[PDB]
Amino acid sequence: VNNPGKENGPVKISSKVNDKQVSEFLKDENMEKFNVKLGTSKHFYMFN
Amino acid sequence: ASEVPQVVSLDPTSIPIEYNTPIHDIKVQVYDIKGGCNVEEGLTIFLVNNPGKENGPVKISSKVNDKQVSEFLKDENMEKFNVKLGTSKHFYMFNDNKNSVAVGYVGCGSVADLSEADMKRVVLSLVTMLHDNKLSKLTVVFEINVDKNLFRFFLETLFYEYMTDERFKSTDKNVNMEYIKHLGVYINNADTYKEEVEKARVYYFGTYYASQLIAAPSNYCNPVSLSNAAVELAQKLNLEYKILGVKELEELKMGAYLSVGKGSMYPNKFIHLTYKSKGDVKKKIALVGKGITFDSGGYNLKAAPGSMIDLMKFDMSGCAAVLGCAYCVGTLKPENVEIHFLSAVCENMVSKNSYRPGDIITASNGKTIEVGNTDAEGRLTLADALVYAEKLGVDYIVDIATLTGAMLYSLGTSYAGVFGNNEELINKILQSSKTSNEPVWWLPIINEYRATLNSKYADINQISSSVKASSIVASLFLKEFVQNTAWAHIDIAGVSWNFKARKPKGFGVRLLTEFVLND
Amino acid sequence: SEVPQVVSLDPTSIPIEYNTPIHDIKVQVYDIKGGCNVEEGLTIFLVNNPGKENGPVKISSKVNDKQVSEFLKDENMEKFNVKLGTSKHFYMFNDNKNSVAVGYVGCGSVADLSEADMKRVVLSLVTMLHDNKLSKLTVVFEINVDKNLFRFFLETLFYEYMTDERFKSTDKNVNMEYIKHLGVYINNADTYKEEVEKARVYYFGTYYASQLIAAPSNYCNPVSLSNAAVELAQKLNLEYKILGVKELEELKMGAYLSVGKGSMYPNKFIHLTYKSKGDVKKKIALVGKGITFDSGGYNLKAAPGSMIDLMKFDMSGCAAVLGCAYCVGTLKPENVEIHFLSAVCENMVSKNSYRPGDIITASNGKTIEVGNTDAEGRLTLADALVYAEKLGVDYIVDIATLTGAMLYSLGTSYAGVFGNNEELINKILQSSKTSNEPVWWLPIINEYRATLNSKYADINQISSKASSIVASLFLKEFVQNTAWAHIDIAGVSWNFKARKPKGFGVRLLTEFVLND
Amino acid sequence: SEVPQVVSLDPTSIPIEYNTPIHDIKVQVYDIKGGCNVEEGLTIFLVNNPGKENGPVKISSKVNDKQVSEFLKDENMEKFNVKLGTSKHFYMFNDNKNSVAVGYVGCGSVADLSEADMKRVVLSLVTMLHDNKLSKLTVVFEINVDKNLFRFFLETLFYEYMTDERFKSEYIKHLGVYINNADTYKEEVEKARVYYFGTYYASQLIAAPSNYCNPVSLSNAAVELAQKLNLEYKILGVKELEELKMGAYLSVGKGSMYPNKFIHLTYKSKGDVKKKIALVGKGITFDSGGYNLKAAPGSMIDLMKFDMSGCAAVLGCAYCVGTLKPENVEIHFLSAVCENMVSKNSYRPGDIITASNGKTIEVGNTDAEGRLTLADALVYAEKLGVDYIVDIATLTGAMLYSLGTSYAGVFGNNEELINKILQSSKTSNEPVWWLPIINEYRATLNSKYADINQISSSVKASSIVASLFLKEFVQNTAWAHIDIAGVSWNFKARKPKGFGVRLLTEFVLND
Ligand SMILES: [Zn+2]
Ligand SMILES: [Zn+2]
Ligand SMILES: [Zn+2]
Ligand SMILES: [Zn+2]
Ligand SMILES: [Zn+2]
Ligand SMILES: [Zn+2]
Known part of the structure; x- marks a missing residue:
């Protein structure tokens, strides 16, 4: 994921995912806590 | 404020x-x-x-x-x-x-x-x-x-x-x-x-x-701005303070410390902060920090590959540890103690006005010193700060300084070295190291090397002709400036800078505070 | 004066x-x-x-x-x-x-x-x-x-x-x-x-x-060189302005002023202008590095092979720009406005010099951590580039004896050209062909930009070995939205065999101005 | 022979x-x-x-x-x-x-x-x-x-x-x-x-x-000493060293015209054995540095005949022990003797070699050869089932910068053993100072390809890093390492000191 223009801007996921648990995790409010700085990563374990 | x-x-x-x-x-x-x-x-x-x-x-x-x-x-x-x-x-x-x-x-x-x-x-x-x-x-x-x-x-x-x-x-x-x-x-x-x-x-x-x-x-943190920051800290903590200027340093005959600062555009400033407990004073301590705001090496310029001249703004780390300790002591307010926070602050520069290799200078205790290398400036400033500290009539003198590059070769980047003239004081520093979790290792002051500091002209040489046991020889030189007081010297040249994280550690603040508090 | x-x-x-x-x-x-x-x-x-x-x-x-x-x-x-x-x-x-x-x-x-x-x-x-x-x-x-x-x-x-x-x-x-x-x-x-x-x-x-x-360097210092530029401008009827220390402080040129701190000669910023009578179709700023003597400063040129004895040549970029002003002022091209710029100073050792580690502020507000006082050229150029861009020009071309690595990459015959705009690079390459002053296009490798990330300041002056490229990446940070090219003449300026300068870049820059 | x-x-x-x-x-x-x-x-x-x-x-x-x-x-x-x-x-x-x-x-x-x-x-x-x-x-x-x-x-x-x-x-x-x-x-x-x-x-x-004292003549001299003192002796040759898989030690000697010779002398006391000790000495008869040649100013290549001072201290100790005949103690006098030379046959910087305990080592510098020979000698010493292993070596030039020419440095994995060495230092009047093995520096020996690096890139704290490397070759025995690189040669008198003989004898005698 990137954010054109907005340097180190928030993460926003556009794809629809076929899992209710994962869609909820991927909501804009949760993802905005993270930023797109090149190479920055976050990953979480959860139940689908 | 200046x-x-x-x-x-x-x-x-x-x-x-x-x-x-x-x-x-x-x-x-x-x-x-x-x-x-x-x-x-x-x-x-x-x-x-x-x-x-x-x-x-x-x-x-x-x-x-x-x-x-x-x-x-x-x-x-x-x-x-x-x-x-x-x-x-x-x-x-x-x-x-x-x-x-x-x-x-x-x-x-x-x-x-x-x-x-x-x-x-x-x-x-x-x-x-x-x-x-x-x-x-x-x-x-x-x-x-x-x-x-x-x-x-x-x-x-x-x-x-x-x-x-x-x-x-x-x-x-x-x-x-x-x-x-x-x-x-x-x-x-x-x-x-x-x-x-x-x-x-x-x-x-x-x-x-x-x-x-x-x-x-070093353009932000120079002898004037660093002594001004120490005044501001003292005022915020209600500590007593005195900044000695050139005129007062000349009257005190601090020739070794004054010679180092001769080549600087910034006048020398000697920091003296005091914390005194409200009740009966049972222990008096002087904490002395090396305060070189920039160390170019002087006429013995840091020009050799790996001499790390770009890091030399860190040469006041000892002074910084002492001031950080003043913050902790001034905030925690320990009882039954009087602490003097000292630093002979200056900058080691190249100028028409600088001291030269070979110059013979007189310390405040009357000892004449032959300068063998202008880059061994820390021990000269510390010699006059140690004479000053002993005149205060304290129980312990502890100095902390980024003194010798050899520390990187002997103990490395994690453990600082402690040298001293008194086993009880060394053990107190080792105990403070354990409780602060700031690692220190006891290193010896080898008396056999003292003869290498015999000068043909002056009372003493600043450096050995080498020898190479630089950290030990520097400690032998400092020992000549403490006559009858328990003294310890902490060489933080290797531990002060976190090379991997590209930042200082603020090493020694917790070590010195634990020492003051647990006494 | x-x-x-x-x-x-x-x-x-x-x-x-x-x-x-x-x-x-x-x-x-x-x-x-x-x-x-x-x-x-x-x-x-x-x-x-x-x-x-x-x-x-x-x-x-x-x-x-x-x-x-x-x-x-x-x-x-x-x-x-x-x-x-x-x-x-x-x-x-x-x-x-x-x-x-x-x-x-x-x-x-x-x-x-x-x-x-x-x-x-x-x-x-x-x-x-x-x-x-x-x-x-x-x-x-x-x-x-x-x-x-x-x-x-x-x-x-x-x-x-x-x-x-x-x-x-x-x-x-x-x-x-x-x-x-x-x-x-x-x-x-x-x-x-x-x-x-x-x-x-x-x-x-x-x-x-x-x-x-x-x-x-005793004859050609920041004061005498700016005086010579005024005399040249008067002889050619060019508009001229010499910016002194007070004006440079008002303009917040902290990177350029820090370099000159240790000199007995006050910094002098040369600004000559040629303007065609008639409609102006192209506006150009030519920026020349003007270090009258480069001792290296506290990072003294003491190493064997550091060529401190040749450092009077460190104003070759400024000299090429002034030589170009002579040609342009004489030939009088139409439809052009040319600004001839040089942030002139001397890099010396003194109680007053800037130090390795100092954090300084350029005229565009960027804080710079000085890693080596001998990388002074890029500091003076950073403020000259900010000044040039404020003029609202179509092209900014700088010329400088910037890096010793040019002697190892292209040698003594070909200068290196770096830039943020392909059309401008091609115009310089074409001017190189017609002036017969050889130039080779070298890349600005973006992957090396991270080496200039400072822990404390906005940017590092130096990386901490592709020196000429890293210097170009640093300069690029001082040009926001203008076509810019940088000509590194460190290897070509001095004719070692004949023991004399070449006056490299005068004909290249004049052909560039004339053929535009 | x-x-x-x-x-x-x-x-x-x-x-x-x-x-x-x-x-x-x-x-x-x-x-x-x-x-x-x-x-x-x-x-x-x-x-x-x-x-x-x-x-x-x-x-x-x-x-x-x-x-x-x-x-x-x-x-x-x-x-x-x-x-x-x-x-x-x-x-x-x-x-x-x-x-x-x-x-x-x-x-x-x-x-x-x-x-x-x-x-x-x-x-x-x-x-x-x-x-x-x-x-x-x-x-x-x-x-x-x-x-x-x-x-x-x-x-x-x-x-x-x-x-x-x-x-x-x-x-x-x-x-x-x-x-x-x-x-x-x-x-x-x-x-x-x-x-x-x-x-x-x-x-x-x-x-x-080094032309007189080479791996062959030095091991022959050790046999003659053992015969005069009635000590048991064994010299391990190349064939035996290959069978024992002593790859770190054998790699060092590859470039030499002299075959590697491993010295093993043993003193058995009369009476019940109360302590078994292995004394290990670095035995480099000449250290050129190998492909990482001692060419730098101040690298002291002309002094490198002294690189077997550790082995010499151990043999001098065997003389004192064999003569004084202490009771209730069994002692093993060991040295992995070889010569570090430049040849078409030499080991190279970057080579990956296998020690006798199966650990692969990446060679970062051919001049850090002592630790390689000592690694195999330490594996050998531990297999003897001893109470203490004490090594003595002219290992690191950094000792000259840390303790200088008068005091040797002692490092170890056991405080009781270190204290016994400091005590022996006090009674022999051969000064030693305890230096730490800083575990935080161990990660600097992590190799990308081999199990371990021979050296740290930079080192910083060279003598400590060398001690961390040696510690990897002792699994479950009290061990101490005495770095004598600074103290062995008397520069002013232009002669050796024979440093460590009295220290090691006092250690054996006072135990
Ligand atoms: Zn210094
Ligand atoms: Zn210093
Ligand atoms: Zn330069
Ligand atoms: Zn230059
Ligand atoms: Zn070696
Ligand atoms: Zn060796």
Whole structure:
């Protein structure tokens, strides 16, 4: 994921995912806590 | 306060200092693990280990007051993860109240007793989970055994490493910089650990304040601005202060210290701060820090490859540790003690006015010194500061200085070296090293090398013709300036700068405070 | 304006020779088809032999003298060969029973001579002029040269022939005598005639730049160099402005001011302007590095091979820009506005010098952590670039003796060009071809940008080995939205073999301004 | 056994002097209470002045000669001063009209003499011995010395007096000592003579150049020593070393014309074994540095014949132990002997080699060869099932910068063993200082390809990093490492010290 223009801007996921648990995790409010700085990563374990 | 001279109007006239840091806004709550863990907003991290079983599975032992979170954290669910030191994982789930919660862990390895170095690795892993995540809260659950001192070290290290110094950023400030407002801690026998919280916050600031002075470049942090910052600190803490200027230093015949500063555009400033307990004074201590704001090497210019001239703004790290200690002492207010915080501040430069290799200079105790190398300036400034300290009639004199490059070859970057003329004082420093978790190793003052300092003309040579045991020879030189007082010298040249993180450590603040407090 | 002195013997100006002996040479161009008159001085034929390597000399031109024509017949000439740079002198009596000197310079066996080959031909012809008291030289072109190469031949001849005696006192050459006349015989002469005065202007721009570079640091300091730029601007009727310390402080030029802190000479920022009468179609800022002496500062040039003795040449970029101002001011191009800029200062060791580790603020507000005081050029250029961009120009071109790594990458013949705009780079490459001042395009590798990330400041001045590229990445941070190119002349500026400057970049920058 | 030669002029053995002139000196110890007899040779008073600058020389002892007593009167002696090492000696006629020489050595103003101070006193005494044809020397102690310091005085005197003339192409026959409580000091005499020889023997091996002292001739000399002392011995050759998979040690010697020789000597005590010890010495007969050649200014390639000083200290210790015969102790004297050379056959920087315990090692620098040979020697020592493993080596040049030329550094994995070494340092008067093994630096030895790196990139703390590497080759035994790179060579006297012989013997004896 990137954010054109907005340097180190928030993460926003556009794809629809076929899992209710994962869609909820991927909501804009949760993802905005993270930023797109090149190479920055976050990953979480959860139940689908 | 003195006026800082400028070459151009764009030259800075003060060191920017952040006193009210975001760490000071963190509300810390300590809970006993026996009452169970509440898992709500922010991020909840378990500090877990597995004794014996190297890279063994994660098992969460604490009672968690949430049926959903307890289920997620069960042995069968956690066994796919391991305790490898510094390892970490993030978890996401819904709790009993149908709210999204972030949980995780930091692996603490398989050794039951963590060293200061191991704890630093755990803290660094925890800090990577705080960075790049906009969190209002962090909760830490201790499922490892830590004594009171190690628990305090955990908090100090967390606060220090979490803090980002943006004083010199203008167009490149981190737009996403957001700090937690709350810190929850769960630990067994919590009531016994509670007193460590505010002590850790004071120790963090003393260390971070020292770090701010060290990191501040030589155009910002010069002898005038550094002595002005010491005055401001003294005024905020209600400490007594005296800044000795050139006229007063000349009257005191501080020829060794004055010669070093001759080539600088900044007049020498000798810092003397005093803390005195309100009741009966049982112990008097002088803490002496090397205060070279920039060390070019002088006419013996740092031109050799690997001489690290670009790092020389750090040559006042000793002074910074002493001032950071003044912050801790002035805040904690120990009883029955009188502490003098001293630094012969100057800058070692190349000029038509500089002292030269071969010059014979007279110290304040009347000893004539033959200068063999202008880059061995620290011992000259310290000689006059030590004479001054002894005239105060103290029980102990402790100096701290980035004195010799050889420390990097002897002890390296983790352990500072301690030298002294008194075994009881050395043992007190070693004990303070254990309780502060700032590592120090006792090194000898080898008397056989004293003859290498015999000068043909002056009373003494500043340096040996080499010899090579530089750190020991420097200690033998310093010993000549303490006549009848228990004295110790801490060489921090190797430990002061964190090369990997490209920042100072603020080394010695906690060590010196523990020394003052536990006396 | 007043140059500070330590002692009364310290010079207060740069001696400059404007009216050189080259300017007293009367040049005449004749068409080769009308034949060659061989009457006096020395007549040199420029001859080649395509295909036949070290082939015989054959004189093709008609010579309007029976005696000389006989001497130059194939049978007499066959003993001589065309090997590149070979030369021979002949002596004979012409039809008027007068002694005449004739000769040739071999131009090899390749029909198209390169700039390097032409330089060898010129050097050989120059050895024939030296140590021979002549009133006149005639050159007969029996080789094929385009208009640009003919002009390069004359510029090179004028530059190489000229001897700089400004600093000679008891050792002036007693036998120094320059020709008063130059005759040129070439095919289609009328097309080459316009190249003569253009070559004379290009020679002087180059020679003027050379005079400033060769002038030592006690003569050529920030005050005397800015005074020389004012005098040049007055002679050419160019608009001029010298910015002093007070104005530089108001403009917040902290990177440039920090470099000059340790000098006894106040910083002087040169701003000359040429504006065409008529509609302005292109606005250009030419920025030259103007370090009058580079000691390295606290990071002193003490290492073996650091060439501290050559550091008076560290204002070569400024000299190229001023030489260009002479050419532009003389030739008067239409539809252009040119700004000639240089942040002039001296990098010294003093109680007042900036230190390694200092954090300084550039005029665009960027904080810079100084990693090495000897990477001073990029600091002065950062503030000059911010200044240039505020002028609202179409192109910014900087020229500087920036990195010693140029000697290892391209060597002493080709300068390196870096930039943020391909069209501008191509224009510089095209100007390189027509000026015959060689340049090679080098990349600005974005992957190295992370090496300039400072822990404390907004940016590091240096990385902590692709030095010339890292210096270009640093400079790129001071140009926000303008086409910019950077010419690193550290390797090409000084002619090590001849022990003199080249005046490199004058012709390249003038061709760039003129052909736009 | 047969030493290879390039030319017929190449030596095939190390010349060794066993019967030295020191062995011919008859030593007598007397109480100072009965007065001093001055009948022949040279008589020296060891005098100090508590409260001096240094102050005047004043002789306290009664002398049984009217002429000598007159010379030694307060008024005459006051013209001389007690400055450490200052001496004066005069020839005169005694009561029997015989030629006698009488003088003093200044002992300073400090009542307690350090090992360094005592060495200065001894040097001054030896200068007088070297420029005087004497049959007898008598030393009068007017200073306080304990039994250990008195033994150190004798050893130092014997060692410094002895001149090594083996490569070149008169001594006193009697030594008299006057001391308070003379009965207390008598047993120290023959112990000093043994300690002197082990030290001098080590010195002879070290001083022997690399053409004389090579892996073959050094292992042959160790066999001859073992035979003379009735010690058990075994020399492991290349075939046996290959079977034992000693890849780290064998790689170092690849570029040498001399085959690797592993020395294993063993002393078994009479009586029940209470402690088993393995003493491991670094045995590099010449260290060129290999492909990482010692070409840098100050790299001291010309001194590199001394790179077997650790092996020499271990063999010198075998002499003392074999002679003094301590009870209830079994000792193994080990050295992985080889030569570090430049050849088409040498190991290269970057090579990955396998140690005898199966650990793969990435070679970062061919000049960090000592730790490679020691790794295999440590694996071998641990397989012997000992209580303590002590290695001694001229390992790191950084010792010169950390402790200098007087104090060796000791590192280890066991505090009780370290304390035993420091205690042996105190009683042998061979100074050692405890240095840490900083576990935080272990990660610098993580190799991308091999199990471990030989060196750290930068190092920083080189001597500590070398100790961390060695620690990887000891699994479950108390181990200590003595780095003698700084102390082994006496730069001012241009000779070896034979450092470590007395330290290791005191360690074995006091256990
Ligand atoms: Zn210094
Ligand atoms: Zn310093
Ligand atoms: Zn430079
Ligand atoms: Zn420069
Ligand atoms: Zn080696
Ligand atoms: Zn070695």
